[PDB]
Short mmCIF file of C-alpha atoms and ligand atoms in Angstrom, two decimals:
data_model
loop_
_atom_site.label_atom_id
_atom_site.label_comp_id
_atom_site.label_asym_id
_atom_site.label_seq_id
_atom_site.Cartn_x
_atom_site.Cartn_y
_atom_site.Cartn_z
CA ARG A 1 -57.87 69.11 63.45
CA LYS A 2 -61.66 68.60 63.34
CA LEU A 3 -61.89 64.80 63.32
CA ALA A 4 -65.23 64.73 65.16
CA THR A 5 -67.81 67.44 64.41
CA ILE A 6 -71.56 67.83 64.72
CA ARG A 7 -72.94 67.65 61.17
CA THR A 8 -76.29 67.31 59.41
CA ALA A 9 -77.55 64.27 57.55
CA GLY A 10 -77.95 65.27 53.93
CA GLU A 11 -79.67 63.21 51.24
CA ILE A 12 -80.37 59.61 52.27
CA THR A 13 -80.43 57.19 49.38
CA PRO A 14 -81.19 53.47 49.36
CA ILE A 15 -78.47 50.90 48.78
CA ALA A 16 -79.88 48.51 46.18
CA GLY A 17 -80.13 44.90 47.32
CA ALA A 18 -79.20 45.68 50.95
CA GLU A 19 -82.36 46.63 52.82
CA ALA A 20 -80.73 46.83 56.30
CA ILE A 21 -78.41 49.79 55.46
CA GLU A 22 -78.65 52.98 53.45
CA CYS A 23 -76.36 55.68 52.12
CA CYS A 24 -76.09 58.95 54.05
CA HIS A 25 -74.57 62.11 52.58
CA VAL A 26 -72.74 64.27 55.14
CA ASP A 27 -71.35 67.45 53.51
CA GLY A 28 -69.20 66.11 50.64
CA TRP A 29 -68.88 62.64 52.23
CA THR A 30 -70.97 59.52 51.68
CA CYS A 31 -71.30 57.16 54.60
CA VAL A 32 -73.23 53.95 55.23
CA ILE A 33 -75.70 53.97 58.13
CA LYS A 34 -78.17 51.51 59.59
CA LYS A 35 -81.51 52.00 57.87
CA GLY A 36 -83.58 54.55 59.77
CA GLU A 37 -80.68 55.59 62.01
CA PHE A 38 -81.05 59.08 60.54
CA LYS A 39 -83.35 60.98 58.28
CA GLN A 40 -82.35 63.99 56.23
CA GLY A 41 -81.74 67.00 58.45
CA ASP A 42 -80.90 65.01 61.59
CA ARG A 43 -77.74 66.02 63.41
CA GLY A 44 -75.02 63.60 64.42
CA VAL A 45 -71.34 63.40 65.23
CA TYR A 46 -69.35 62.66 62.11
CA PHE A 47 -65.94 61.05 62.55
CA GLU A 48 -63.69 61.57 59.55
CA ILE A 49 -61.47 58.99 57.94
CA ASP A 50 -58.06 58.89 59.70
CA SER A 51 -59.82 59.28 63.04
CA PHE A 52 -58.50 56.87 65.66
CA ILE A 53 -61.23 55.87 68.11
CA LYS A 54 -60.20 54.24 71.39
CA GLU A 55 -61.83 50.90 72.20
CA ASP A 56 -65.32 51.18 73.74
CA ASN A 57 -67.98 48.57 72.94
CA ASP A 58 -70.76 50.46 74.70
CA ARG A 59 -70.45 53.58 72.54
CA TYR A 60 -68.70 52.11 69.48
CA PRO A 61 -69.74 48.43 69.16
CA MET A 62 -69.81 48.84 65.38
CA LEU A 63 -66.00 49.12 65.68
CA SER A 64 -65.32 46.03 67.84
CA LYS A 65 -63.84 43.59 65.28
CA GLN A 66 -61.57 46.38 63.94
CA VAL A 67 -59.69 47.23 67.15
CA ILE A 68 -55.90 47.39 66.67
CA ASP A 69 -52.85 48.35 68.72
CA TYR A 70 -51.68 51.81 67.66
CA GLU A 71 -49.20 54.07 69.47
CA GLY A 72 -49.71 52.09 72.69
CA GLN A 73 -53.53 52.29 72.65
CA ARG A 74 -56.33 49.93 71.64
CA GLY A 75 -58.69 51.50 69.13
CA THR A 76 -59.99 51.66 65.58
CA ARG A 77 -58.70 53.53 62.55
CA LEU A 78 -61.50 54.81 60.34
CA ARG A 79 -60.60 54.29 56.69
CA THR A 80 -62.14 54.24 53.23
CA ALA A 81 -64.28 51.16 52.53
CA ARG A 82 -66.50 49.66 49.81
CA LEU A 83 -69.87 48.41 51.12
CA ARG A 84 -72.23 46.55 48.76
CA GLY A 85 -70.49 48.42 45.93
CA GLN A 86 -70.99 51.68 47.84
CA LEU A 87 -68.12 54.00 48.77
CA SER A 88 -68.19 54.52 52.56
CA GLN A 89 -66.06 57.05 54.44
CA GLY A 90 -66.36 57.90 58.12
CA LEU A 91 -68.68 57.17 61.01
CA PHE A 92 -71.94 59.04 61.65
CA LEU A 93 -73.70 58.55 64.98
CA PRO A 94 -76.91 60.21 66.22
CA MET A 95 -76.73 62.95 68.85
CA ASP A 96 -78.59 60.81 71.41
CA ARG A 97 -75.55 58.58 71.84
CA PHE A 98 -73.72 61.64 73.27
CA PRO A 99 -75.62 62.99 76.30
CA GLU A 100 -72.66 65.27 77.11
CA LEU A 101 -73.17 67.11 73.79
CA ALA A 102 -76.78 68.14 74.57
CA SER A 103 -75.85 71.82 74.81
CA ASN A 104 -73.73 71.84 71.65
CA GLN A 105 -74.54 73.39 68.27
CA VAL A 106 -74.25 72.23 64.68
CA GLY A 107 -70.71 72.60 63.38
CA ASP A 108 -69.03 72.33 66.79
CA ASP A 109 -65.67 70.59 66.94
CA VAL A 110 -66.07 67.78 69.51
CA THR A 111 -62.70 66.10 68.80
CA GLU A 112 -61.19 66.92 72.19
CA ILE A 113 -64.28 66.26 74.29
CA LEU A 114 -64.67 62.82 72.67
CA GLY A 115 -60.94 61.97 72.91
CA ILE A 116 -60.46 61.33 69.20
CA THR A 117 -56.92 61.30 67.82
CA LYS A 118 -55.42 61.18 64.33
CA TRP A 119 -54.06 58.06 62.65
CA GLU A 120 -51.11 58.60 60.35
CA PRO A 121 -48.87 56.33 58.28
CA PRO A 122 -45.43 55.58 59.70
CA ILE A 123 -42.81 58.19 58.89
CA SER A 124 -39.96 57.12 56.62
CA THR A 125 -36.49 56.24 57.91
CA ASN A 126 -34.19 59.19 57.07
CA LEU A 127 -36.99 61.74 57.34
CA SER A 128 -36.88 61.66 61.10
CA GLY A 129 -33.58 63.24 62.05
CA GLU A 130 -32.05 64.92 65.00
CA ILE A 131 -34.31 67.86 65.69
CA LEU A 132 -32.80 71.31 66.07
CA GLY A 133 -35.97 73.08 67.15
CA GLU A 134 -39.70 73.63 66.85
CA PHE A 135 -41.24 74.08 63.45
CA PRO A 136 -40.96 77.88 63.15
CA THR A 137 -44.00 79.67 64.54
CA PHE A 138 -43.48 82.35 61.86
CA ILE A 139 -44.10 79.90 58.98
CA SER A 140 -47.45 78.36 58.10
CA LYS A 141 -47.56 74.58 58.01
CA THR A 142 -48.69 72.93 54.77
CA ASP A 143 -51.89 71.12 55.79
CA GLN A 144 -54.79 71.46 53.33
CA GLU A 145 -58.52 71.14 53.99
CA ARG A 146 -60.53 68.53 52.06
CA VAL A 147 -63.07 69.60 49.43
CA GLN A 148 -65.59 67.33 51.18
CA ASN A 149 -65.47 69.74 54.12
CA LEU A 150 -65.89 72.89 52.02
CA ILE A 151 -69.42 72.75 50.55
CA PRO A 152 -70.33 76.42 51.27
CA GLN A 153 -66.89 77.77 50.39
CA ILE A 154 -66.92 75.85 47.09
CA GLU A 155 -70.17 77.58 46.15
CA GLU A 156 -69.00 80.91 47.62
CA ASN A 157 -66.00 80.70 45.24
CA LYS A 158 -68.01 80.08 42.07
CA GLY A 159 -66.28 82.04 39.30
CA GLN A 160 -62.88 82.06 41.03
CA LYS A 161 -59.75 80.68 39.34
CA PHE A 162 -57.44 78.13 40.95
CA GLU A 163 -54.03 76.73 40.18
CA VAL A 164 -54.41 72.95 39.92
CA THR A 165 -51.36 70.91 40.89
CA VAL A 166 -50.77 67.20 41.30
CA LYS A 167 -50.71 66.08 44.94
CA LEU A 168 -47.44 64.17 45.35
CA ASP A 169 -47.30 61.44 48.01
CA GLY A 170 -44.09 62.11 49.88
CA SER A 171 -43.39 64.17 52.96
CA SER A 172 -43.73 67.90 53.58
CA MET A 173 -40.43 69.79 53.59
CA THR A 174 -39.78 73.48 54.30
CA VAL A 175 -36.52 75.31 53.52
CA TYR A 176 -36.40 78.87 54.77
CA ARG A 177 -34.36 81.99 55.47
CA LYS A 178 -35.08 84.37 58.32
CA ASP A 179 -32.39 87.07 58.57
CA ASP A 180 -29.05 85.39 59.43
CA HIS A 181 -30.53 81.88 59.70
CA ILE A 182 -31.37 79.30 57.07
CA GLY A 183 -33.09 76.12 58.19
CA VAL A 184 -34.47 72.87 56.83
CA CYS A 185 -37.68 71.45 58.30
CA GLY A 186 -39.75 68.40 57.87
CA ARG A 187 -43.47 68.42 58.53
CA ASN A 188 -43.40 69.29 62.25
CA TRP A 189 -39.81 70.11 63.28
CA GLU A 190 -36.63 71.86 62.16
CA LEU A 191 -33.79 69.43 61.53
CA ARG A 192 -30.03 69.25 62.03
CA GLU A 193 -27.87 68.76 58.98
CA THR A 194 -26.31 65.31 59.09
CA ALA A 195 -24.79 63.17 56.37
CA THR A 196 -27.84 60.94 56.59
CA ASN A 197 -30.73 63.45 56.70
CA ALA A 198 -32.81 63.25 53.52
CA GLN A 199 -34.34 66.73 53.68
CA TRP A 200 -30.99 68.49 54.03
CA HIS A 201 -29.59 66.33 51.23
CA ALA A 202 -32.36 67.36 48.83
CA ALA A 203 -31.84 71.00 49.80
CA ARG A 204 -28.11 70.91 49.09
CA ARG A 205 -28.51 68.92 45.87
CA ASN A 206 -30.86 71.42 44.20
CA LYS A 207 -28.92 74.43 45.60
CA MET A 208 -32.11 75.89 47.10
CA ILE A 209 -30.17 77.14 50.14
CA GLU A 210 -27.85 79.02 47.78
CA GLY A 211 -30.98 80.20 45.98
CA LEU A 212 -32.42 81.67 49.18
CA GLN A 213 -29.11 83.38 49.95
CA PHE A 214 -29.34 84.79 46.43
CA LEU A 215 -32.92 86.08 46.80
CA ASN A 216 -31.95 87.73 50.12
CA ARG A 217 -35.54 87.54 51.41
CA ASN A 218 -37.30 85.96 54.37
CA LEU A 219 -39.00 83.17 52.48
CA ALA A 220 -40.04 79.60 53.20
CA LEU A 221 -39.75 77.23 50.24
CA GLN A 222 -42.41 74.57 50.81
CA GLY A 223 -42.67 71.36 48.85
CA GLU A 224 -42.78 67.58 48.87
CA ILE A 225 -39.70 65.38 49.14
CA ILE A 226 -40.55 62.16 47.26
CA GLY A 227 -38.64 59.17 45.93
CA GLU A 228 -37.09 55.95 47.13
CA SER A 229 -38.22 54.65 50.54
CA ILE A 230 -40.58 57.66 50.88
CA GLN A 231 -44.16 56.44 51.35
CA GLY A 232 -43.78 53.57 48.89
CA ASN A 233 -42.18 55.76 46.17
CA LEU A 234 -45.32 55.96 44.03
CA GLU A 235 -43.54 57.87 41.27
CA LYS A 236 -40.82 55.15 41.09
CA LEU A 237 -38.09 57.78 41.26
CA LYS A 238 -34.42 56.95 41.57
CA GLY A 239 -33.07 58.72 44.62
CA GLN A 240 -35.13 61.47 46.24
CA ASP A 241 -36.04 65.01 45.26
CA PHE A 242 -37.94 68.13 46.32
CA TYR A 243 -40.89 69.50 44.36
CA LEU A 244 -42.03 72.98 45.32
CA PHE A 245 -45.72 73.76 45.80
CA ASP A 246 -45.75 76.96 47.91
CA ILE A 247 -43.61 79.93 48.97
CA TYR A 248 -44.50 81.59 52.28
CA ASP A 249 -43.58 85.27 52.71
CA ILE A 250 -42.39 85.37 56.31
CA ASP A 251 -42.32 89.15 56.66
CA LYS A 252 -45.86 89.63 55.34
CA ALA A 253 -47.19 86.42 56.97
CA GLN A 254 -48.79 85.22 53.75
CA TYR A 255 -48.26 82.87 50.82
CA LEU A 256 -47.05 84.06 47.45
CA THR A 257 -49.66 83.88 44.73
CA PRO A 258 -49.20 81.21 42.04
CA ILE A 259 -48.01 83.88 39.60
CA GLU A 260 -45.62 85.35 42.15
CA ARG A 261 -44.34 81.84 42.95
CA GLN A 262 -43.87 81.02 39.28
CA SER A 263 -41.81 84.17 38.68
CA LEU A 264 -39.64 83.52 41.68
CA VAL A 265 -39.14 79.94 40.48
CA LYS A 266 -38.20 81.20 37.01
CA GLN A 267 -35.63 83.58 38.51
CA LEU A 268 -34.07 80.77 40.57
CA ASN A 269 -33.95 78.72 37.36
CA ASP A 270 -32.43 81.62 35.40
CA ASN A 271 -29.64 81.88 38.02
CA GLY A 272 -28.65 78.23 38.16
CA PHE A 273 -30.75 77.03 41.11
CA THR A 274 -33.28 74.72 39.48
CA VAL A 275 -35.95 74.07 42.08
CA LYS A 276 -38.40 71.60 40.61
CA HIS A 277 -42.15 72.25 40.94
CA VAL A 278 -45.10 69.90 41.57
CA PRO A 279 -46.83 69.29 38.20
CA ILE A 280 -49.09 72.20 37.24
CA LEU A 281 -52.25 71.49 35.25
CA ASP A 282 -54.68 73.88 33.55
CA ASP A 283 -56.02 76.65 35.77
CA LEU A 284 -59.62 75.84 36.67
CA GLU A 285 -62.46 78.36 36.82
CA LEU A 286 -64.49 76.96 39.68
CA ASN A 287 -68.14 76.20 38.88
CA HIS A 288 -68.46 72.72 40.35
CA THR A 289 -69.89 70.50 43.07
CA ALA A 290 -67.57 68.74 45.50
CA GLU A 291 -68.50 65.47 43.77
CA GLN A 292 -67.33 66.88 40.44
CA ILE A 293 -64.08 68.18 41.95
CA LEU A 294 -63.43 64.73 43.42
CA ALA A 295 -64.09 63.22 40.00
CA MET A 296 -61.09 65.18 38.68
CA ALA A 297 -58.74 63.86 41.37
CA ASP A 298 -57.85 60.61 39.59
CA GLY A 299 -55.37 60.68 36.72
CA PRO A 300 -51.68 60.77 35.86
CA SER A 301 -49.15 61.81 38.50
CA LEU A 302 -45.65 63.24 37.93
CA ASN A 303 -44.87 59.79 36.58
CA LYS A 304 -47.64 59.64 33.99
CA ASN A 305 -47.81 55.83 34.11
CA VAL A 306 -49.02 55.85 37.75
CA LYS A 307 -52.32 57.04 39.19
CA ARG A 308 -51.91 60.12 41.39
CA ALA A 309 -52.99 60.60 45.02
CA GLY A 310 -55.17 63.57 44.02
CA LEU A 311 -55.12 67.31 43.37
CA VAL A 312 -54.56 70.53 45.30
CA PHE A 313 -56.34 73.76 44.32
CA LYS A 314 -54.87 77.17 45.11
CA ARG A 315 -56.89 80.29 44.36
CA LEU A 316 -55.02 82.84 42.26
CA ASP A 317 -54.74 85.31 45.15
CA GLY A 318 -53.11 82.55 47.23
CA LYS A 319 -55.60 82.90 50.09
CA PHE A 320 -57.93 79.91 49.63
CA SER A 321 -56.64 76.39 49.05
CA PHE A 322 -57.92 72.84 49.37
CA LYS A 323 -57.06 69.24 48.52
CA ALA A 324 -59.07 66.71 46.51
CA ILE A 325 -57.78 63.24 47.31
CA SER A 326 -58.46 60.49 44.78
CA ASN A 327 -60.80 57.90 46.26
CA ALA A 328 -59.52 55.32 43.77
CA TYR A 329 -56.08 55.91 45.30
CA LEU A 330 -57.44 55.31 48.81
CA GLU A 331 -59.02 52.01 47.75
CA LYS A 332 -55.81 50.86 46.06
CA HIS A 333 -53.55 51.91 48.96
CA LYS A 334 -55.10 50.62 52.19
CA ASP A 335 -52.17 52.17 54.10
CA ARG A 336 -53.51 55.68 53.36
P1 AMP B 1 -52.24 65.31 51.95
O1 AMP B 1 -53.59 64.64 52.13
O2 AMP B 1 -51.08 64.56 52.57
O3 AMP B 1 -52.33 66.72 52.71
C1 AMP B 1 -51.65 67.88 52.23
C2 AMP B 1 -50.16 67.65 52.08
O4 AMP B 1 -49.86 67.20 50.74
C3 AMP B 1 -48.53 67.52 50.41
N1 AMP B 1 -48.55 67.96 48.99
C4 AMP B 1 -48.23 67.16 47.95
N2 AMP B 1 -48.42 67.78 46.75
C5 AMP B 1 -48.91 69.00 47.02
C6 AMP B 1 -49.33 70.17 46.22
N3 AMP B 1 -49.30 70.17 44.88
N4 AMP B 1 -49.75 71.26 46.88
C7 AMP B 1 -49.82 71.30 48.22
N5 AMP B 1 -49.45 70.27 49.02
C8 AMP B 1 -48.99 69.12 48.49
C9 AMP B 1 -48.03 68.57 51.41
O5 AMP B 1 -47.05 67.95 52.26
C10 AMP B 1 -49.29 68.89 52.23
O6 AMP B 1 -49.00 69.15 53.60
MN1 MN B 2 -49.36 63.43 52.17
#
C-alpha cells in the first residue's frame, strides 16, 4: 500500500495547444502538472490513482471541486482522466509543499504520514458473507503490483519469460486446505458456508473442495469469481463461476510455478474436478518498456466480444508477478 511516495520527475513534454500545463512522466505514469511546477529530476510526492485524499484546500486546492462523501469522510478520489487529449493519472506535488518531509529520501512511502487512504469500488451483494475468521496468515493475498511502478524490475527481468493471463474483473476468492480444515475466503476474510454465499456456491459447484481432498495437500486455490451482479459482469456470464489464476503452496510458503499449476489443474480435470482457469495467452519473453507492456493490456477478455480489464504477468519461476491494467478500460469504466 504505497499510495503516496517520493518520486522523481522524469521527462517533461509540452501539451500542444495548452501552454499553462505540461505532461510529466513519473516512473511508468504520465501526469499533468502546472507548467514549470517541476523540471526533470525534481522530487515530489506522487499520489497514485485510487488514492483518497481528505479535504484540505490549503494543501490540495487543485482537488476542491472534486470533494465527495466516501466512507464517512470528505475527500477526493484520484482517478484516470483525459486532459487536452492527454492521459493523466495521479497527483504530483513538489517537496516544498511538505515541510514535514524535509528529512525524507527518494522512494520513501509517505502514505501514513500524509493520511492517504485507498478508494475501492463497492463490494457485491452476496460476496460479503458472515465471516468465520481472518484471512489466513499462512496464505499470500492476491494483490499485484502495477507495471508503472516497476521500471527497474522490468529492465532487470529482460530476457525472462512470463505467463500472460487475462485479468478478469470479479472478486478474489481463495479455497484452501490446511490439514483437517478446508476453508473458503473472499479477498480479506474467511467465510461461513450459507445457502446464499456466492464464493462457497462456486466452490461446491466446480467440486474444488472435493479436488483438494483428493490432492491431500496444503494448497490454496486462488482465482476470480466473476459473473452476474459481480462488478458489472463484464463477461456477460450467466450465473457465477471461479477461474483459477494461482496455487499457493502453504507448506513451502510459495506459489506454484505456471507449469506446476497447469499440471495440477490437468490432474484435477483428469479426475472429474474441472476447475476453470483464467485465459492463458502466449508466454512472453520480456524485452519491453512499461509503455509497451501497457500497450498490450487492451484486447479480448474471456468473452472475446468485450474489451478486457488488462493483463497479469507471472514469471515462469512463479516469484515475480505484476499487473498491466488497460487504460482504455479505465476511461470506459469511470467506476474503476
Ligand atoms: P486488479 O487491479 O484488481 O488487482 C489484482 C487482482 O486481480 C484479480 N485477477 C483477475 N485476473 C487475474 C489473473 N489472471 N491473475 C492474477 N490476478 C487476477 C485478483 O483478484 C487480484 O487480486
Ligand atoms: Mn480487480
